Amino acid sequence: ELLGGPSVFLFPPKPKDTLMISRTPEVTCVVVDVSHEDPEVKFNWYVDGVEVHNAKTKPREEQYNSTYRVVSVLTVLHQDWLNGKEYKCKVSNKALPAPIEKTISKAKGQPREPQVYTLPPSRDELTKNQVSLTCLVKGFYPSDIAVEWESNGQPENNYKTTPPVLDSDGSFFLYSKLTVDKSRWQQGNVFSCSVMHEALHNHYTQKSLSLS
Amino acid sequence: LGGPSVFLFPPKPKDTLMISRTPEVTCVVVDVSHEDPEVKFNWYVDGVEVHNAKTKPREEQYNSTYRVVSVLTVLHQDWLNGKEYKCKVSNKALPAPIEKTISKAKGQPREPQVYTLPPSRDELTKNQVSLTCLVKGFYPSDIAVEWESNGQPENNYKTTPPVLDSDGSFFLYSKLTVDKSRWQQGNVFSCSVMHEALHNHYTQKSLSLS
Amino acid sequence: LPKAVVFLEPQWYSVLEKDSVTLKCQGASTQWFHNESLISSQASSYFIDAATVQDSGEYRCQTQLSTLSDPVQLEVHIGWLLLQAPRWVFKEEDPIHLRCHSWKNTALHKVTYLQNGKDRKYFHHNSDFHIPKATLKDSGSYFCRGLVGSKNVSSETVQITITQ
Numbered sequence: 001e002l003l004g005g006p007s008v009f010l011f012p013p014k015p016k017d018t019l020m021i022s023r024t025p026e027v028t029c030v031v032v033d034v035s036h037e038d039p040e041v042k043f044n045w046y047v048d049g050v051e052v053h054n055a056k057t058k059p060r061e062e063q064y065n066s067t068y069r070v071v072s073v074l075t076v077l078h079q080d081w082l083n084g085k086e087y088k089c090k091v092s093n094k095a096l097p098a099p100i101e102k103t104i105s106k107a108k109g110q111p112r113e114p115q116v117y118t119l120p121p122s123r124d125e126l127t128k129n130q131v132s133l134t135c136l137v138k139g140f141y142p143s144d145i146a147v148e149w150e151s152n153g154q155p156e157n158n159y160k161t162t163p164p165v166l167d168s169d170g171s172f173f174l175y176s177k178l179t180v181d182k183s184r185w186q187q188g189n190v191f192s193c194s195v196m197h198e199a200l201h202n203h204y205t206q207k208s209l210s211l212s
Numbered sequence: 213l214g215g216p217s218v219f220l221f222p223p224k225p226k227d228t229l230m231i232s233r234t235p236e237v238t239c240v241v242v243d244v245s246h247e248d249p250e251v252k253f254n255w256y257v258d259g260v261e262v263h264n265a266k267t268k269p270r271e272e273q274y275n276s277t278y279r280v281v282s283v284l285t286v287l288h289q290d291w292l293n294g295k296e297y298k299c300k301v302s303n304k305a306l307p308a309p310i311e312k313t314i315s316k317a318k319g320q321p322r323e324p325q326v327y328t329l330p331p332s333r334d335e336l337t338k339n340q341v342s343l344t345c346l347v348k349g350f351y352p353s354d355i356a357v358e359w360e361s362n363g364q365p366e367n368n369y370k371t372t373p374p375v376l377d378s379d380g381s382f383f384l385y386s387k388l389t390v391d392k393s394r395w396q397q398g399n400v401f402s403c404s405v406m407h408e409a410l411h412n413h414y415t416q417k418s419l420s421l422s
Numbered sequence: 423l424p425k426a427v428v429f430l431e432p433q434w435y436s437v438l439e440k441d442s443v444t445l446k447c448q449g450a451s452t453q454w455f456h457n458e459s460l461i462s463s464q465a466s467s468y469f470i471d472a473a474t475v476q477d478s479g480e481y482r483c484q485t486q487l488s489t490l491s492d493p494v495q496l497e498v499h500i501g502w503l504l505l506q507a508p509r510w511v512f513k514e515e516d517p518i519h520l521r522c523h524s525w526k527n528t529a530l531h532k533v534t535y536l537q538n539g540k541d542r543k544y545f546h547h548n549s550d551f552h553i554p555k556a557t558l559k560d561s562g563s564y565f566c567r568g569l570v571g572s573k574n575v576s577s578e579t580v581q582i583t584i585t586q
């Protein structure tokens with residue numbers, strides 16, 4: 001019983017996908033709550049008001065709640081996304097009085113360059129068998145950012161990054177924690193925190209951290 | 213389907229962790245019409261009705277509906293021992309009463325470890341610097357973190373939400389911002405953590421120039 | 423010679439697509455004019471089963487014992503909701519009748535009628551908004567809003583004038 005008919009949700013690219021030319025950023029338009037009685041969905045796509053035809057729509061899938069869900073994916077140009085072009089998904093269906101339009105674009109506001117600081121473990125944590133390497137990334141805007149770690153130039157895996165947190169001056173900050181065996185820290189392997197953000201020169205910085 | 217709506221809110225972690233404070237469960241009812249504005253609250257603790265809740269007078273909201281609040285004081289130890297609190301709301305516009313239940317997050321508690329981190333060498337070239345308090349390995353995620361120096365609270369700090377770590381416990385960071393002067397003079401700053409799995413529900417770590 | 427009259431059942435001059443509307447003529451077979459073109463139909467009343475936006479515009483009736491009727495302007499809108507009133511200009515003390523009409527009469531709940539951005543009246547289930555006597559305080563921009571199942575929908579704003 002879907003009184004309101006179908007709903008639409010429109011998702012932006014991943015930050016890393018827009019910051020690296022080797023990757024392909026995508027805008028994702030998801031129509032959910034499609035009834036079995038009128039399952040035909042039409043997708044129109046617009047960039048700054050101009051229709052495009054290079055979208056890729058996959059056919060429907062029945063859900064657990066016995067409705068259909070349908071996804072259309074449009075790849076975007078990095079420079080287009082980053083220059084603030086608007087992406088519009090228009091979804092047509094009979095169960096609606098009019099077609100639903102949704103629009104997304106990169107977050108507005110003046111870019112601010114993130115400052116990256118690496119912080120070694122506390123003395124008090126050197127008594128355990130794993131230790132925490134910390135990367136503080138502050139003073140950035142907008143909050144779209146990606147953070148990775150490496151050890152001696154090879155990617156590390158066991159790390160977690162807090163969400164961006166709005167700071168008192170309107171920029172964001174976050175922390176990233178890499179957990180390493182104390183052996184690897186005391187042996188002197190060089191760890192590095194890598195930050196990708198639009199306001200960085202070449203969209204990329206890296207800070208290093210070593211015993212120490 | 214229409215009718216009023218009920219939201220039931222837990223105490224603040226700090227209020228359940230300190231004996232001098234008073235924790236409270238809060239039952240809020242919204243979308244109460246002028247036409248049927250009388251709301252009855254029944255309160256149950258582990259299924260036994262209690263009678264010490266304080267119901268407030270209704271208040272008209274910006275959208276011309278009424279909202280009415282009923283507040284139940286809870287004993288610290290009852291909340292931390294996992295008792296269930298149930299608010300039951302009766303109104304003429306409901307077909308049958310709405311019931312909501314709330315209690316402390318379940319799961320094995322783990323003791324948070326607290327580590328202060330001084331500012332990066334590279335940040336010392338700025339007018340203001342970041343003092344970091346890392347709190348990790350704790351469960352459940354309810355926690356309070358505060359800063360102070362010389363016994364007085366420090367205002368200019370922000371704390372991340374808890375993050376689920378790859379071992380099932382939580383961590384967060386708290387960042388205090390201070391003028392570089394205050395750091396280089398030698399003042400001691402200190403990070404206070406409140407969590408049910410600490411001894412005295414409390415611990416404290418200091419941070420000073422070496 | 424008497425000019426025929428055009429009456430609408432129901433009384434709303436603004437409807438949504440897929441509303442029904444009967445336009446009756448009051449004169450004396452009759453002849454109907456939509457956008458000044460004879461249509462079709464030639465029964466006493468002209469009936470629209472499911473309005474579309476093309477059905478909008480000017481209508482006129484006429485019968486053998488009457489002149490060409492003064493025109494009536496019918497408006498068809500697209501949306502989930504439409505604020506309807508028998509008219510939009512009111513003297514003081516006149517009664518105000520507002521209807522929050524939903525597309526295909528879809529069940530609508532948690533309805534509010536809003537004047538100048540501030541919700542003025544709330545109902546659990548869709549109902550008409552009645553102001554028995556109009557004050558100068560009642561002028562302004564009005565619309566209605568509610569939940570269609572779980573979807574939060576809203577109507578366009580209509581201007582209400584109280585003269586005076």
Ligand SMILES: *[C@@H]1O[C@H](CO)[C@@H](O[C@@H]2O[C@H](CO)[C@@H](O[C@@H]3O[C@H](CO[C@H]4O[C@H](CO)[C@@H](O)[C@H](O)[C@@H]4O[C@@H]4O[C@H](CO)[C@@H](O[C@@H]5O[C@H](CO)[C@H](O)[C@H](O)[C@H]5O)[C@H](O)[C@H]4NC(C)=O)[C@@H](O)[C@H](O[C@H]4O[C@H](CO)[C@@H](O)[C@H](O)[C@@H]4O[C@@H]4O[C@H](CO)[C@@H](O)[C@H](O)[C@H]4NC(C)=O)[C@@H]3O)[C@H](O)[C@H]2NC(C)=O)[C@H](O)[C@H]1NC(C)=O
Nearest residue numbers: 009011012013014025026027028030032033063064065067
């Ligand atoms: C039947 O069952 C259906 C499921 O099978 C169910 O469908 C769900 O319906 C929900 C609504 O009822 C809907 O909820 C919305 O979800 C939004 C977030 O969804 C993402 O995250 C979820 C977990 O948090 C995931 O489960 C979702 O799948 C989705 O996950 C994202 O997916 C995208 C694309 O797949 C992906 O991006 C792409 O990734 C690829 C790689 O995979 C590439 O990287 C691409 O480049 C990239 O584009 C994301 O990475 C992925 N994210 C994650 C985290 O995994 C959520 O945003 C919605 O909230 C808004 O609206 C509600 C109102 O409904 C508000 O309450 C809420 O506050 C938000 O409101 C908005 O806030 C905005 C602030 O920014 C503001 O702008 C707006 O003003 C404000 N209002 C509006 C209207 O926007 C919302 O919760 C859920 O996603 C559906 N699930 C699925 C699987 O589709 C259906 O409901 C069931 N039917 C019935 C009748 O019950």
Ligand SMILES: *[C@@H]1O[C@H](CO)[C@@H](O[C@@H]2O[C@H](CO)[C@@H](O[C@@H]3O[C@H](CO)[C@@H](O)[C@H](O)[C@@H]3O)[C@H](O)[C@H]2NC(C)=O)[C@H](O)[C@H]1NC(C)=O
Nearest residue numbers: 456457458459474475476477478479480496497498499500
């Ligand atoms: C009788 O006259 C009225 C008024 O001239 C006509 O109403 C108009 O109908 C057209 C056609 O549907 C509407 O234009 C459409 O607008 C949408 C929205 O931008 C656009 O996407 C379409 O391509 C189309 O241009 C127009 O809005 C509407 N005007 C008014 C004031 O309602 C009516 O259609 C005429 N009917 C006949 C049978 O001739």
Ligand SMILES: *[C@@H]1O[C@H](CO)[C@@H](O[C@@H]2O[C@H](CO)[C@@H](O[C@@H]3O[C@H](CO)[C@@H](O)[C@H](O)[C@@H]3O)[C@H](O)[C@H]2NC(C)=O)[C@H](O)[C@H]1NC(C)=O
Nearest residue numbers: 273274275531532533539540541567568569573574575576
């Ligand atoms: C359906 O969606 C609308 C649009 O978002 C929701 O309306 C919004 O309701 C909030 C809460 O009443 C309004 O905020 C209020 O603002 C005033 C001052 O501006 C303040 O005094 C209140 O405390 C509150 O913060 C908000 O303005 C309003 N949005 C608009 C555009 O007017 C509505 O609640 C939704 N309804 C349902 C049933 O989901």
